[PDB]
Write a protein that binds this ligand. Structure first.
Ligand SMILES: *[C@@H]1O[C@H](CO)[C@@H](O)[C@H](O)[C@H]1NC(C)=O
Ligand SMILES: *[C@@H]1O[C@H](CO)[C@@H](O)[C@H](O)[C@H]1NC(C)=O
Ligand SMILES: N[C@H](C(=O)O)C1[C@@H](C(=O)O)[C@@H]1C(=O)O
Ligand SMILES: N[C@H](C(=O)O)C1[C@@H](C(=O)O)[C@@H]1C(=O)O
Lengths: 518, 520
């Protein structure tokens, strides 16, 4: 029963997948270091900054009530009940920052709307959340996968990968994400060899079984992935067991996390992944690296985090071995800012700017929470927050690279993505930015390192022999057969053989006909 | 400081929600006791549970407990209270299902909460059509029909008496608005125009209502006013009309229904009103039960005392600093109590949940009549889809079995769309409601037994009637309003809307019905 409760004049609830999904009968498992602990600290970071800022909510201290979602929608939902009992020890919640997984953000959203509690997600990308008729108190600093799916399909359409396999996570993230892709695929004449999907309480066999099925479609060497972070790790490990090798094209679920490929790097080599377009928040690196078990007591999960990151033990762990060097530290050699940290910070600041404007509007005489704001109107708040437009928390260089945080009419963020390629050049494995997507695809193909040093081929059928075969399309529009032609016929075009006619014969290259002698 | 509730343990527990108290006015959350739709309905659930707990053929071996809460007639409050039902699935009683919501707004919000934890819910009075949408309210069912039908019965009654020009007033919320929306659609199809569409709502005071009356008055021709309002709001509107002594022929939905409490203190303003209510029949055994209740033998209902003091204008030792202690011989009886119109639906709702749990226990626990391990943790999703397919004869408390006394649900989880039409009379010096018809699929009513307002069957049309002596009825663009064109002295009225030349040698009769020959 861990949580972070910090009092304040106004309190923001927070939800993070601090722990991985519990396996079997347990509800929570291992620590999610980057997407759990880091992101949690980024909200703590943002709250601290805002509490030191004399121009944003001066006179109104922001507190928090942060809870673990353990990467499970049902668990996050039960936890969230904590945010609403509040409006009846318990802290009144002005708004909630959170949900990483779309499924948890959705369920939490169905609960928070009942009590008019605004919610801002910093990572939930499902297109379902754009529906303001169902999630009317939900907003997010990231875009809907309606766009990510387009970026992925256009990438395949570029390298002409017309025959691919897809595996998607069960849940609102993977399923709706994969559906969007399928639609985008059709429109670009891309066929799906086989559509697999893993899900809830799935064990090895479920994944091993997916690898087998992918293998049963040898021609489909490129496999599209729209899977949760946890499931991705599982699928990669499975491929590693039977040493399966495909060119992976995964969504942000996998993203640019090295943790997903750890221990199966050669299997994911050459993979192409996507992640929302972002830039690290510099002041955050300083904050996070200054954290250690001695100065960070407000984060009840930090000790378990520390022990797992460094393979520790102090006096607060199970019956293990190897105590830990008091000189260990989070630093430039073992830490790298999580890709979505920026969105966590701007989500919190968005809520703050929305409360600030509301306080200036209802409390014109003081900087304090006046009686008129004693009981917040969350409906108004949400429609005082949707219209917000401000420059990304100080923590962002320039102001011309469109560093403005604001929301769509659907409460969504801008659909900008970056494309990455998992390389290893320097002995070590890393993600290199090899392109991006803003409205049209963009990537310099020369910097990409493929699997098996060769740009992958993923088509239904083998290419026809030149010397004489014509391309023949059967019933579908992806597969075909090759029909060698009569020695006296030439290829008027790729799919049609025609008689050169009397006195004539086809040219060595079969492009035309030359006259016969004798 | 003291938030009351009823907690009775059992092998299985049913949550309950009833508007025991009226909406609180101003800063307070709850107000006066709602006697009929509050206390009665509450006790009808306690009644049903007792009977079930004595029935050896229904849930024998499994005692039903309850967790009944007050909604104070407010969705937000009902919502906060319901949280109690979900925390339970984590002192607290585990909820197998919830019986409740009277007002649609509370049933809807509660349904939005309960579905998240797959807790089945059966409402005994919420009629909003929205609730038929199993894509949003997938854990909700009800023993009553959607107003999709009630609105049709109302529009067909107007179309009958040719009331083509009417005003409407709807309560803000899912009951009044969706209800009035259905009527508006039904009206158009039957060529009925709406003079003015008013609507009262949340935190509304006198002026909001007085203002509605004034606007109704600004449409004198529309003498018939259609109402689709909550009980509480209805009472306000009628009180408002009573102040400026405004008089219209009211056609109200079940919200008003056949409650005498709505008209009390303004009976002459509501005289001749026509109201609808769901077709039901009193549950005889309940009369006996409710009548045997008194502050001495009914300690399990923590609201009964307040109830008592208000019904009789009492005081004992558990009340404010008032006067007049109360006669220890008072008693609820045939002279001061009449079964609330929807009691039958509360009993059936509760019985439906029991039958659903009963069938599930017989299925999952084949060796005993006890709640076996297999059912220690109920699968609410299954319960709901074991409960939707339920079909049984109305709790013993219903005579015959041929008048279709079978409780079941639509594919939408709704009940059957059958209504009764009532007329507010006063013949015997006292005001009362008289059944003057009913609606099953087609309207039906014997016009002769109806007592109208101002002893004359109302006229509710757009334009003033044409002068006889020479005017012809003329229809412009719509089918509700018209203009009257006096005719030439040499024209007669071949028909109400047509003037024709009598032709040479002839001249129209004083009456204008024909032409007579000219002398000279
Ligand atoms: C097939 O893909 C290659 C690789 O980008 C490209 O050069 C070529 O133009 C494409 N051909 C088709 C079918 O458009
Ligand atoms: C309604 O109008 C019809 C047709 O004009 C008429 O026959 C009927 O009597 C009217 N209904 C009543 C009873 O007012
Ligand atoms: N975009 C993911 C989702 O909406 O579910 C979210 C990823 C993240 O936390 O960055 C998590 C996921 O892997 O699904
Ligand atoms: N049928 C009403 C509704 O759906 O809201 C319900 C009436 C009742 O409790 O009998 C209450 C109301 O007044 O609206």
């Amino acid at each position: 029963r861990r949580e972070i409760k910090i009092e304040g004049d106004l309190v923001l609830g927070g939800l993070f997948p601090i722990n991985e999904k519990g396996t079997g009968t347990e509800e929570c498992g291992r620590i999610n270091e980057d997407r759990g602990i880091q992101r949690l600290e980024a909200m703590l970071f943002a709250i601290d900054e805002i509490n030191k800022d004399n121009y944003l909510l001066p006179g109104v201290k922001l507190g928090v009530h942060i809870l673990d979602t353990c990467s499970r929608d049902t668990y996050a939902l039960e936890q969230s009940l904590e945010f609403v009992r509040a409006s009846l020890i318990p802290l009144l919640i002005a708004g909630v920052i959170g949900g990483s997984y779309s499924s948890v953000s959705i369920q939490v959203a169905n609960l928070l709307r009942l009590f008019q509690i605004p919610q801002i997600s910093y990572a939930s990308t499902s297109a379902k959340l754009s529906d303001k008729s169902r999630y009317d108190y939900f907003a997010r600093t990231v875009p809907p996968d309606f766009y990510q799916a387009k970026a992925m399909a256009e990438i395949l359409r570029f390298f002409n990968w017309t025959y691919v396999s897809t595996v998607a996570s069960e849940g609102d993230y993977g399923e709706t994400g994969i559906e969007a892709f399928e639609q985008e695929a059709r429109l670009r004449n891309i066929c799906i060899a086989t559509a697999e999907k893993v899900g809830r309480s799935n064990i090895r066999k479920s994944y091993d079984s997916v690898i087998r099925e992918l293998l049963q479609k040898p021609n489909a060497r490129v496999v599209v992935l729209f899977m949760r972070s946890d499931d991705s790790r599982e699928l990669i490990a499975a491929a590693n067991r039977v040493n399966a090798s495909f060119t992976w094209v995964a969504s942000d679920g996998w993203g640019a996390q090295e943790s997903i490929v750890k221990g199966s790097e050669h299997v994911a080599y050459g993979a192409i992944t996507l992640e929302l377009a972002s830039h690290p928040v510099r002041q955050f690196d300083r904050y996070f690296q200054s954290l250690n078990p001695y100065n960070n007591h407000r984060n009840p999960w930090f000790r378990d985090f520390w022990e797992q990151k460094f393979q520790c033990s102090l006096q607060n762990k199970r019956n293990h071995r190897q105590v830990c060097d008091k000189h260990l530290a989070i630093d430039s050699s073992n830490y790298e800012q999580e890709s979505k940290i920026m969105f966590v910070v701007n989500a919190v600041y968005a809520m703050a700017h929305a409360l600030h404007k509301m306080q200036r509007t209802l409390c014109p005489q003081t900087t304090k929470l006046c009686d008129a704001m004693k009981i917040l109107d969350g409906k108004k708040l949400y429609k005082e927050y949707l219209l917000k437009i401000q420059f990304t928390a100080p923590f962002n260089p320039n102001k011309g690279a469109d560093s403005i945080v604001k929301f769509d009419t659907f409460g969504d963020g801008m659909g900008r993505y970056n494309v990455f390629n998992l390389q290893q050049t320097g002995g070590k494995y890393s993600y290199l930015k090899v392109g991006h997507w803003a409205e049209t695809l963009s990537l310099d193909v020369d910097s990409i390192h493929w699997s098996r040093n060769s740009v992958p081929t993923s088509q239904c059928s083998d290419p026809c022999a030149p010397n004489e075969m014509k391309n023949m399309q059967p019933g579908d529009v992806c597969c075909w057969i090759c029909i060698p032609c009569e020695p006296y016929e030439y290829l008027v075009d790729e799919f049609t053989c025609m008689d050169c006619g009397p006195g004539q014969w086809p040219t060595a290259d079969l492009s035309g006909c030359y006259n016969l002698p004798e």
